Design a protein around this ligand. Sequence first.
Ligand code: T12
Length: 295
Amino acid sequence: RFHSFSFYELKNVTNNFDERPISVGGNKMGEGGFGVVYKGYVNNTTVAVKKLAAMVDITTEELKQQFDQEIKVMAKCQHENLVELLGFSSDGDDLCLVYVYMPNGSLLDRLSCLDGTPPLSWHMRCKIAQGAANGINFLHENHHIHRDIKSANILLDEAFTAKISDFGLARASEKFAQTVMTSRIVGTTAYMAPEALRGEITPKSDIYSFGVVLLEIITGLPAVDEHREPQLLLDIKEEIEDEEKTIEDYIDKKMNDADSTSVEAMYSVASQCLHEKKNKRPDIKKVQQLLQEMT
Ligand SMILES: CC(C)(C)C(=O)Oc1ccc2c(c1)nc(NC(=O)c1cccc([N+](=O)[O-])c1)n2CCCO
C-alpha cells in the first residue's frame, strides 16, 4: 500500500507546520480549505504534506470520507499524469496526506506568474494540455469521475509535466446503466457543467471542466475574475461564437511562440468540450486524439 508516518514525524519535517511562506523561511506552500500544503523533507527527499482542515460546510466525518477516498483512489490509480501518494497520518487528528513534491506549483499560479515565475511558452502549454488529457483518460478508463477538474488541481513537476491531484471527491462510475444523481452538489462553480450544477454525476462533466482549463491555458485568464467583464471565462465561447470576438483577441500575450494553427486547434477542442449538451461533448479518448493531432 503506502507508508504510514507518525503525526510526530510529519510535525518535525514541516517545522511545527510552520505557517509562513517559504520566502520568509516558513513551510506553507498553499491552501484551499480542504486543507493546507506544507513543504516537507524526509530522506534528503522533499515532499508535500497536506494537513486536512475542518471548515463550516463539512462534518468531521465528511472530511474523513475525503481522506479515505483520496487513499482509496491513489491505491487503484498510478499514472505518469497523476500525483503520487507516499503515505498518510491519522493519529494526532489533523489527518495528513504525504505526496511526492511538485516543484512547479499549480497550473493556475504558473498561468498567473505568481511570485514572479516566468510565463509558460506555447510549447510548454501544449505538453501540459496533452499531459492533463492523458491523466483524465486513465481516470475514466478506471471508472473514476474526478468532479473537480480545474487548473488549481493540475500540478507541475520538475519538467513541467502536468499531474492531476485532489481525488477526495472522486466517484466510481459504471457502464452508464442509468443517469446518476447527487443530493450533495460539489465542484467549483466557474468550471462546472450545467448538469453538475443540477446534481448529475457523469464523466461528461469532467470533459466540460477540462474545456474550461483549455481556455485558461490559451488565454492565461483565470476562469472567474469578479473585477473582469465577462466575469466567467466560459462566457468567451459565446462572444467568439456570436462573432462579437476573435479567439486571437484573447490569446495570452505573454508568449512569443504561439502559432494560429495550433492555437485554433486547441480552441476547437475547448469549444467541443464545452457543449451545453453533455451528450454532444467529445469523450476523453477523443480529446486526447485531437490534442495529439494539434502537435
Ligand atoms: C517554487 C515555485 C516555482 C514558486 C513553486 O511552484 O512552488 C510551489 C508552490 C506551491 C506548491 C508547490 C510548489 N508544490 C505544491 N504542492 C505539491 O507539491 C503537491 C504535490 C502532490 C500533491 C499535492 N496535493 O495538494 O494533493 C500537492 N504546492 C502547493 C499547492 C499548489 O500551489
